[PDB]
Design a protein around this nucleic acid. Structure first.
Ligand SMILES: [Zn+2]
Lengths: 135, 213, 101, 24, 82, 61
RNA sequence: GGUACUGCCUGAUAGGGUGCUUGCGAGUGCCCCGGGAGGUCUCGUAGACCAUG
RNA sequence: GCGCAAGACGGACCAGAGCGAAAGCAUUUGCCAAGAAUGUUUUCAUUAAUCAAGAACGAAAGUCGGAGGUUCGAAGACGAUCAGAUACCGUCGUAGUUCCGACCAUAAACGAUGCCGACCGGCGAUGCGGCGGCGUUAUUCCCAUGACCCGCCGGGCAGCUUCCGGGAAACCAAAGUCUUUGGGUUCCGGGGGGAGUAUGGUUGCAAAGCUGAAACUUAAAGGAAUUGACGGAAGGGCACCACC
């Protein structure tokens, strides 16, 4: 059910981990990135709006997607980590580190770790207001 | 309902003759239903590959954008597209007490390929230096800038894509620029941080065949 | 009563500085005043280091580090306790805290 | 507060500028 | 401090003080005599020389002007006068 | 796997109510591995602790 | 003639980059050959950061 | 993931650094004219300091015309919180934010410190030009020149330090050289309110700007610092009438 490769060589997928403070995506694709293998989101696994982001959501999501892909013949994963970017947080959400750890537990091989958060040269104005968002 | 993953097929992306290691990997493409040719949908991909993976001895932070063009029947022919530095390296260089210097050139190679070449350099702290900061006056900076421009322009303009990428792999160009500008100011880390592609020549099979082997 | 000689901001001999957007807040603050904290850490944190180190296809693969420049408006800092108030004389000392052991 | 009673004063003054017009 | 001869400064210090702040205003520049090696001719040149000065017959360029001092071309000897 | 643990030092007492004791763990397998660990109830130096999950690490309550 | 050393890269046993030894800090060693034996190198060690009254 | 388009904005580098009369001013490259400091055994020979009248520039918002509309976004519309929120939070979103052309002349336009000049303790730093000086480097020797390195000089932005002296004190090398009271000059305050309101005059398309009272009212209003008490501030600390 997948590529034909010997025991020594590992098939590389590429993993996009998207961690906001809202919810996390663990999304695995081809090397090209033009074909998605599998996509599991932090809020699909657990039901609540509060739990969408939390490290547990990423745990579940990652275990599941890494399972489904361990099915289809991808042992190794190149990882491109993401924070929401743009005008907003460059800091990665809480779910990412826990998700990566999680699908590392699942028996998957890890490729090169890259950090891509879209980073402006210079941005359009931020979503708040002069005095900021107060609360 | 119906498994989309049984209509998929596996192909092999292999790099050009430029580097050492050939097979970069596998690519997954849905089979031809006759309404859509799978050879065509597979024709436009960019592949982000670390230099350490293509050639065994080199640094990890150099990434190459490689484009598929022709498919050989489970063999994908890839031609050079772009080059860039890993974000991490880029940030690792930039610091708060040094002047940064940047420039870029748009050069047509001898085979017609059109490239935007970017260059990044830094004022280096001298070895016995007591003064906290290393800063280049604006005129010095303009000078260095001009010389970078000159150098890489001269390097690419004379040669075709082949030799160009061959110079890009170890990055001869960087050490070149460092060396030459030592009179103006002791530049520190100097790279081609990015390579872009503007205009490719009209596609020809033979050229690519030569490039692969 | 004038509180700081420097008025909280680094501005001297120039009329106006470019305003910037708070990391946490979005509250507009001039770059001179803005509390800046630079962050160099590892992408994956403490335990998952030893964890992932074993799952690699590469040998002696060093973990990438995340670099983030942070700006905090005066309020947010005192909230996050990145900065806390100190005594009248002790204020005068601009020497940074001893994180170097 | 100052800013607001300055404002209120301008409201009142505009209103007085209306109630007394040069036609009166 | 509290005792100084403003009348008899040490010559060194006076070399140190700015040209106008000296006990007497003393120009810091001198007329120098330049000689190009390949020719016999002697030429009087102001220490800090604007423009550009020439040896007439040889078309020799003696010195380039700079911010502080004119800088003579290489190998050309010079002597401060008096 | 179940493992054994040796107590190298007593550091401090973690807790809201100050319940747990933060204790430093050597491995009884003669390995030089050193992991910080939380233990409930009284602990003095030299005791041996039974670890059901032996790769886990200590966090601050 | 006497007498030292010597990781890799560049461009000299100089200059400029950059390393491994135990996580860190010390030590120690790392040009070539032949032969010889002796081996879990030694000493220290926080390295801890996810309303109304 | 690949391309395309539009308009905004120039991150990190960026600093108690620079430049400008002040507003203000950071992508590359060229063109156009300015400008301080420095260097000078150049030239003119008092041409100079400050300024009623009068003139030039003047953030943001605002107003008229035009173009343009990505982001953000007053008004408005919902959704929440709430006893009540026409508010803080959130989704949508007009004017505006952007460019060109005409108005407006106001900011906590702040160093809350007019300008020119003279004198008065140190000390390290920095920016710019100059001068001098072993030694490193741009590979091996000669001069240039650049990068560090050690000083000196003149402007600058600042800093630290001090029984210089001030000062109501906070603090200030100017806010010092003040009853031992006089270097030159402009603006300007006279308890608090009433009020920067009324009126007239004047400028503007409009919003407003500049000039600007009185009747009356009132024993304080205020500035520094000092002990308290409090804080929904940050720290420590204890107690089985706190918990584990
Ligand atoms: Zn804030």
């Amino acid at each position: 059910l997948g590529p034909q490769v010997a025991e020594g060589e590992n098939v590389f997928g590429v993993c996009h981990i998207f961690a906001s403070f809202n919810d996390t995506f663990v999304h695995v694709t081809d090397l090209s990135g033009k074909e998605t293998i599998c996509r599991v989101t932090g809020g699909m696994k657990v039901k609540a709006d509060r739990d969408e982001s939390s490290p547990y959501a990423a745990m579940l999501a990652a275990q599941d997607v890494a399972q489904r892909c361990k099915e289809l013949g991808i042992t190794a994963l190149h990882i491109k980590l993401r924070a929401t970017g743009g005008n907003r947080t460059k800091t990665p959400g809480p779910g990412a580190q826990s998700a990566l750890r999680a699908l590392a537990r699942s028996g998957m091989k890890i490729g090169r770790i890259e950090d891509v958060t879209p980073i402006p040269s210079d941005s359009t104005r931020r979503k708040g207001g002069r005095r900021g968002r107060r609360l | 309902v119906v498994d989309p993953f049984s209509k998929k097929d596996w192909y092999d992306v292999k790099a050009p003759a430029m580097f050492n290691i050939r097979n970069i990997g596998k690519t997954l493409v849905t089979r031809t239903q006759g309404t859509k040719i799978a050879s065509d949908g597979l024709k436009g991909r960019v592949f982000e590959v670390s230099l350490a993976d293509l050639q065994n001895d080199e640094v990890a932070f150099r990434k190459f954008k490689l484009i598929t063009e022709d498919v050989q029947g489970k063999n994908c022919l890839t031609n050079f597209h772009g080059m860039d530095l890993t974000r991490d390296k880029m940030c690792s260089m930039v610091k708060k007490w040094q002047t940064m210097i940047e420039a870029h050139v748009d050069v047509k190679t001898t085979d017609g390929y059109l490239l935007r070449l970017f260059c990044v350099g830094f004022t280096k702290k001298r070895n016995n230096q007591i003064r906290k900061t290393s800063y280049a006056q604006h005129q010095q900076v303009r000078q260095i800038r001009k010389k970078m421009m000159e150098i890489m322009t001269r390097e690419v303009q004379t040669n075709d894509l082949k030799e160009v990428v061959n110079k890009l792999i170890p990055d001869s160009i960087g050490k070149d620029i460092e060396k030459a500008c030592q009179s103006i100011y002791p530049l520190h880390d100097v790279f081609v941080r990015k390579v872009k592609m503007l205009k490719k020549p009209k596609f020809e099979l033979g050229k690519l065949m030569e490039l692969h082997g | 009563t004038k509180k700081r000689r420097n008025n909280g901001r680094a501005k001297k001999g120039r009329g106006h500085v470019q305003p910037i957007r708070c990391t946490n807040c979005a509250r507009c603050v001039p770059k001179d005043k803005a509390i800046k904290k630079f962050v160099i850490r590892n992408i994956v944190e403490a335990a998952a280091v030893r964890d992932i180190s074993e799952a690699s296809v590469f040998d002696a693969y060093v973990l990438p580090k995340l670099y983030v420049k942070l700006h905090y408006c005066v309020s947010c800092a005192i909230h996050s306790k990145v900065v806390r108030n100190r005594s009248r004389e002790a204020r005068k000392d601009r020497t940074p805290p001893p994180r170097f052991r | 507060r100052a800013k607001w009673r300055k404002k209120r004063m301008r409201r009142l003054k505009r209103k007085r500028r209306k109630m007394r017009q040069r036609s009166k | 401090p509290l005792a100084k001869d403003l009348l008899h400064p040490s010559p060194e210090e006076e070399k140190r003080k700015h040209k106008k702040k000296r006990l007497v205003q003393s120009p810091n520049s001198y007329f120098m005599d330049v000689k190009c090696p390949g020719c016999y001719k002697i030429t009087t040149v102001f220490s800090h020389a604007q423009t550009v000065v020439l040896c007439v017959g040889c078309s020799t360029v003696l010195c380039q002007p700079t911010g502080g001092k004119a800088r003579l071309t290489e190998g050309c000897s010079f002597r401060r006068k008096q | 796997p179940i493992k054994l643990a040796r107590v190298t030092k007593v550091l401090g007492r973690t807790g809201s109510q100050g319940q747990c004791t933060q204790v430093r763990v050597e491995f009884m397998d003669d390995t030089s591995r050193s992991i910080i660990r939380n233990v409930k109830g009284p602990v003095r130096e030299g005791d041996v602790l039974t670890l059901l999950e032996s790769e886990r690490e200590a966090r601050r309550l």
